[PDB]
C-alpha cells in the first residue's frame, strides 16, 4: 500500500523532470554551432614513447607543471616520467599489483593509486630520506577502487565498485563524506576546476553531479545505454562529457540539466575507455577499445582526427594543463605523447 | 649537449630501467593462478592444502613459485575487472561434488551443481580466457560417495541413464563440465578429484601448470 503509492510518486517526479528538461530544449547545440567553421583535420605525431612498464597500463595523470606525469600498470609499478626527456623520475613498487587508477596531486608532493585491493594508497614524493614512501592507506571501500582525484594535499575523492564515492581526510585517514545514490559500480569521476563539485559515471548508465561540501547529489544525467567508463569536465566547469560501452560520447550541460550532443560513428562499435578535453574545450579526445584515440569536434560533433599508435586498448589519456600535449596509455605497456605541428 | 645534472638524471633513469627489468624477470618466474568457485565448494580447503579485496596466496613447489588470487570478496560486477586477470597461467575452479542434490540457499529452488555449471560456463567461455587452461577440482568426493547411496544422481540430472556406482556417477559429472567448454582447440581442462585428506592436489597443479607452460613456450617458439 504505502510502498506502491510511493513508487508511483517517483514515476510522477521523473516525468516532471523530463518535462522540465524538454521545456528548455528550445534549440540544439548542433543548430547553434552550424555556422562556425570546422576545426579542419587535426594531425598529431608521437613526440615521445615512454617505455619501461612490462604489463597493461591502466591509468595515467599529468602533474600540474605539464611536464611530470604518473602512470600505473599491473606489473605492480608506479612510474613518474619526465615527459620532456623521457627520464624516469621515480619508480614506486606497489604492494598490490592490481592497480586500476592513479592520481597526481596538484602540489606535486603526492601520488595516489588503488585497485582490486579496495585501498587508496597515498605516496609521499618529497621526503628527507630520498625515497617514495606510503604516507596513508585509505580503507573503507567494500569494492575495487576505480578512480581517485586530489583536491589538495589533505583531501582526495575516490570512486569505488561498491556503488559509492567518498571524500577522504588524508591526515586522519577517515572518509569525511560518503556519496551514495549510484545503483552500479562507479567507474570514474572528474573534479570541477574550482573543486566544489564533481561528476561520477557508474555502471547504471547515469552520471551524477555531487556537491563536495554539502555531500548530496545535485543532478542526475541519463541517456547512455551501457556502463559509463569515463567522464571529464568542460574547462569552464559548466558541462561534462562521458564515454560508455555503447561506442558513444555525450556532452551534458549542468545548467540546462540535459544532454547537448552525441559523439558516435557507424564504424565505431567498441567501448570507450577515456575522455578528455583540449585546453579551450574545442576538442574532445576519446580512447577506444579498437586501439585508437579519436579526436572529436566538441561543438560540431565531427571526428577531427585519429591517434593510431597503439597495438592494444587505449586505456587512459590526459591533456596537460597548458594544453601543449596529450598522453595516451595503453594495454600494450607504452605511453605516447602527441601534439601537432604548423 | 646535456648539462652536468642532466647526465646524472639520465644515469638515474638507467638505474631505474635496470631495476624494472630485474623485477620483471623475477615476476616472470611466478605462476599466476586465478582461484574461482562458489561458496561451500571446498575453495577455502584447497588453499589450506596449497599452503578486504583480493586475497593472494604464495607457495612454492619444486622450485616453482605460485601466486594464487582469490576474488570471492569482490561483490562488484565481474566483467569490469575480469580482464585484469587476462594472462594468468591457469584458472583453478573448485566444485563440490556433494552439492549435486543440495539447493542454493539464496534462490531456494536452484540446484547448487547447476549454479556451478553456469559459473564454469561463463568463465570458461569468457572472451578474456580464450587461451587460458582451467584446472578443475571436484571436492568433497568422500561425502559425495556417501550421498550417492542415499540420493541418486537423478535429482541433479533428470536425463541420466547411468548406474548409481561411485565411479560412474563421478565420471558423468566430470564429462558434464568438460562438455561446457567451447574452446576445445585453444584451451584444455584438467580435472582432479580432491578430498580433505588428499595431499596430491599440489602435485596435480604443478603437473597441470608445467603442461600449460610448455604448450605456451612451443607457441612462442613457433612449433605450436
Amino acid at each position: 500500500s504505502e510502498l506502491d503509492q510511493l513508487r508511483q510518486e517517483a514515476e510522477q517526479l521523473k516525468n516532471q523532470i523530463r518535462d522540465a528538461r524538454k521545456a528548455c530544449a528550445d534549440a540544439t547545440l548542433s543548430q547553434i554551432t552550424n555556422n562556425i567553421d570546422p576545426v579542419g583535420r587535426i594531425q598529431m605525431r608521437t613526440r615521445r614513447t615512454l617505455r619501461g612498464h612490462l604489463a597493461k597500463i591502466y591509468a595515467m595523470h599529468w602533474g600540474t607543471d605539464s611536464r611530470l606525469l604518473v602512470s600505473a600498470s599491473q606489473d605492480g609499478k608506479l612510474i613518474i616520467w619526465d615527459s620532456y626527456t623521457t627520464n624516469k623520475v621515480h619508480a614506486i613498487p606497489l604492494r598490490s599489483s592490481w592497480v586500476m587508477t592513479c592520481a597526481y596531486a596538484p602540489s606535486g608532493n603526492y601520488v595516489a593509486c588503488g585497485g582490486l585491493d579496495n585501498i587508496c594508497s597515498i605516496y609521499n614524493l618529497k621526503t628527507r630520506e630520498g625515497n617514495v614512501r606510503v604516507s596513508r592507506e585509505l580503507a573503507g571501500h567494500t569494492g575495487y577502487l576505480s578512480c581517485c582525484r586530489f583536491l589538495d594535499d589533505n583531501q582526495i575523492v575516490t570512486s569505488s565498485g561498491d556503488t559509492t564515492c567518498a571524500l577522504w581526510d588524508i591526515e586522519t585517514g577517515q572518509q569525511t563524506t560518503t556519496f551514495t545514490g549510484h545503483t552500479g559500480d562507479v567507474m570514474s569521476l572528474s573534479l570541477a576546476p574550482d573543486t566544489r563539485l564533481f561528476v561520477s559515471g557508474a555502471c547504471d548508465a547515469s552520471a551524477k553531479l555531487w556537491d563536495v561540501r554539502e555531500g548530496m547529489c545535485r543532478q542526475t544525467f541519463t541517456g547512455h545505454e551501457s556502463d559509463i567508463n569515463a567522464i571529464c569536465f568542460f574547462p569552464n566547469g559548466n558541462a561534462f562529457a562521458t564515454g560508455s560501452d555503447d561506442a558513444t560520447c555525450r556532452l551534458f550541460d549542468l545548467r540546462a540539466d540535459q544532454e547537448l550532443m552525441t559523439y558516435s560513428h557507424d564504424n565505431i562499435i567498441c567501448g570507450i575507455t577515456s575522455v578528455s578535453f583540449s585546453k579551450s574545450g574545442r576538442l574532445l579526445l576519446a580512447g577506444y577499445d579498437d586501439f585508437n584515440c579519436n579526436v572529436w569536434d566538441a561543438l560540431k560533433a565531427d571526428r577531427a582526427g585519429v591517434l593510431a599508435g597503439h597495438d592494444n586498448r587505449v586505456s587512459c589519456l590526459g591533456v596537460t594543463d597548458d594544453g601543449m600535449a596529450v598522453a595516451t596509455g595503453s594495454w600494450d605497456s607504452f605511453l605516447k605523447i602527441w601534439n601537432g605541428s604548423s | 649537449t646535456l648539462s652536468a645534472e642532466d647526465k646524472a638524471a639520465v644515469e638515474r633513469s638507467k638505474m631505474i630501467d635496470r631495476n624494472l627489468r630485474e623485477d620483471g624477470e623475477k615476476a616472470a618466474r611466478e605462476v599466476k593462478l586465478l582461484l574461482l568457485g562458489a561458496g561451500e565448494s571446498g575453495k577455502n580447503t584447497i588453499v589450506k592444502q596449497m599452503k578486504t579485496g583480493i586475497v593472494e596466496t604464495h607457495f612454492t613447489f619444486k622450485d616453482l613459485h605460485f601466486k594464487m588470487f582469490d576474488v570471492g570478496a569482490q561483490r562488484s560486477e565481474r566483467k569490469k575487472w575480469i580482464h585484469c586477470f587476462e594472462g594468468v597461467t591457469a584458472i583453478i575452479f573448485c566444485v563440490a561434488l556433494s552439492d549435486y542434490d543440495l539447493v542454493l540457499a539464496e534462490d531456494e529452488e536452484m540446484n547448487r551443481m547447476h549454479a556451478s555449471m553456469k559459473l564454469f560456463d561463463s568463465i570458461c567461455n569468457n572472451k578474456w580466457f580464450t587461451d587460458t587452461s582451467i584446472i578443475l577440482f571436484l571436492n568433497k568426493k568422500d561425502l559425495f560417495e556417501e550421498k550417492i547411496k542415499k540420493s541418486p544422481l537423478t535429482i541433479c540430472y533428470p536425463e541420466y541413464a547411468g548406474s548409481n556406482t561411485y565411479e560412474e556417477a563421478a565420471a558423468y559429472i566430470q564429462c558434464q563440465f568438460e562438455d561446457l567448454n567451447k574452446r576445445k582447440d585453444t584451451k584444455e581442462i584438467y580435472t582432479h578429484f580432491t578430498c580433505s585428506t588428499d595431499t596430491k592436489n599440489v602435485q596435480f597443479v604443478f603437473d597441470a601448470v608445467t603442461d600449460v607452460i610448455i604448450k605456451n613456450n612451443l607457441k612462442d617458439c613457433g612449433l605450436f
Epitope: 628527507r128 630520498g130 | 652536468a4 645534472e5 638524471a9
Partner: single-chain antibody, 230 residues
C-alpha cells in the same frame, strides 16, 4: 639524516689516509656523493664525486691520480682513499649527499666533516666581508666567467651558508629555488653571469659566510665567499 666522517688526523707528508663517511637515516644508495674540503681560513673546494650506482666518478685536477673515492652501499659508507698527501691537502673534508632528478635539490645535506692535517669556471665574490645590522636587508653578489644559464632553461648556481662552527647548508639551488627548511626571507635573483642573494630582515642566525657554487659542469667551483658580520 646523518653523515658522520672519520679517519682524519695528523699525517706525515707523502703518506696515505682513508676517510670514511657513514650514512644513516636516508637511502644512501639513491644519492650521489661528493667530497668537499675547506682549507683553514679559506673557502670551499670540491674534491671528488661518485654517482649513485658507482657508475660515474669525477675528480678535481689537484687531486686526480692521488685520491680514490668509493662507496659501500650495503654498509652505507662513503670512502676517500688518499695517497701522496701534501701540505696543500690540509683541510676539513665534508661528506655531501646529492640526488639528481627533475626538481631535485642537490647538495642539500652536508656532514660535520673530518679534519686532516699534513705536516674551469671562475666564481667571483669580490666583497669579502659585509657589515650588517639585524632587521636590515642585505644583498650578496656573485659573478661567473661563463654563463651558468643552460640551453634547457636552468641556471646552475647554488648558494650555501656556513655558520661559524657549523657545516655548510644549502640556501638556494639553481639560482632561484629555496631549499627545504630555509626561511622565505632568503631570495635568489640572477641573470646570465651576475647573481644576487637577497636576505630580507636579517637575523642573528644568518650571520656567517656565504658561498656561491656552479653546477653547470665539472669540476664544481666555489666562490671565495662573502662574510656577514654584526
Amino acid at each position: 639524516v646523518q653523515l658522520v666522517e672519520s679517519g682524519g688526523g695528523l699525517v706525515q707528508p707523502g703518506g696515505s689516509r682513508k676517510l670514511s663517511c657513514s650514512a644513516s637515516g636516508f637511502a644512501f644508495s639513491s644519492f650521489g656523493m661528493h667530497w668537499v674540503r675547506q682549507a683553514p681560513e679559506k673557502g670551499l673546494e670540491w674534491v671528488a664525486y661518485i654517482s649513485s650506482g658507482s657508475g660515474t666518478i669525477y675528480y678535481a685536477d689537484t687531486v686526480k691520480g692521488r685520491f680514490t673515492i668509493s662507496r659501500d652501499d650495503p654498509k652505507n659508507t662513503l670512502f676517500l682513499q688518499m695517497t701522496s698527501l701534501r701540505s696543500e691537502d690540509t683541510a676539513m673534508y665534508y661528506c655531501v649527499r646529492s640526488i639528481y632528478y627533475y626538481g631535485s635539490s642537490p647538495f642539500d645535506f652536508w656532514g660535520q666533516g673530518t679534519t686532516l692535517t699534513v705536516s674551469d669556471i671562475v666564481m667571483t665574490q669580490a666583497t669579502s666581508s659585509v657589515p650588517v645590522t639585524p632587521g636590515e636587508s642585505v644583498s650578496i653578489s656573485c659573478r661567473s666567467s661563463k654563463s651558468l644559464l643552460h640551453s634547457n632553461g636552468n641556471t646552475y648556481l647554488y648558494w650555501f651558508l656556513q655558520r661559524p662552527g657549523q657545516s655548510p647548508q644549502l640556501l638556494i639551488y639553481r639560482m632561484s629555488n629555496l631549499a627545504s627548511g630555509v626561511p622565505d626571507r632568503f631570495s635568489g635573483s640572477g641573470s646570465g653571469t651576475a647573481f644576487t642573494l637577497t636576505i630580507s630582515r636579517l637575523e642573528a642566525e644568518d650571520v656567517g659566510v656565504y658561498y656561491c657554487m656552479q653546477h653547470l659542469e665539472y669540476p664544481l667551483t666555489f666562490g671565495a665567499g662573502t662574510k656577514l658580520e654584526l
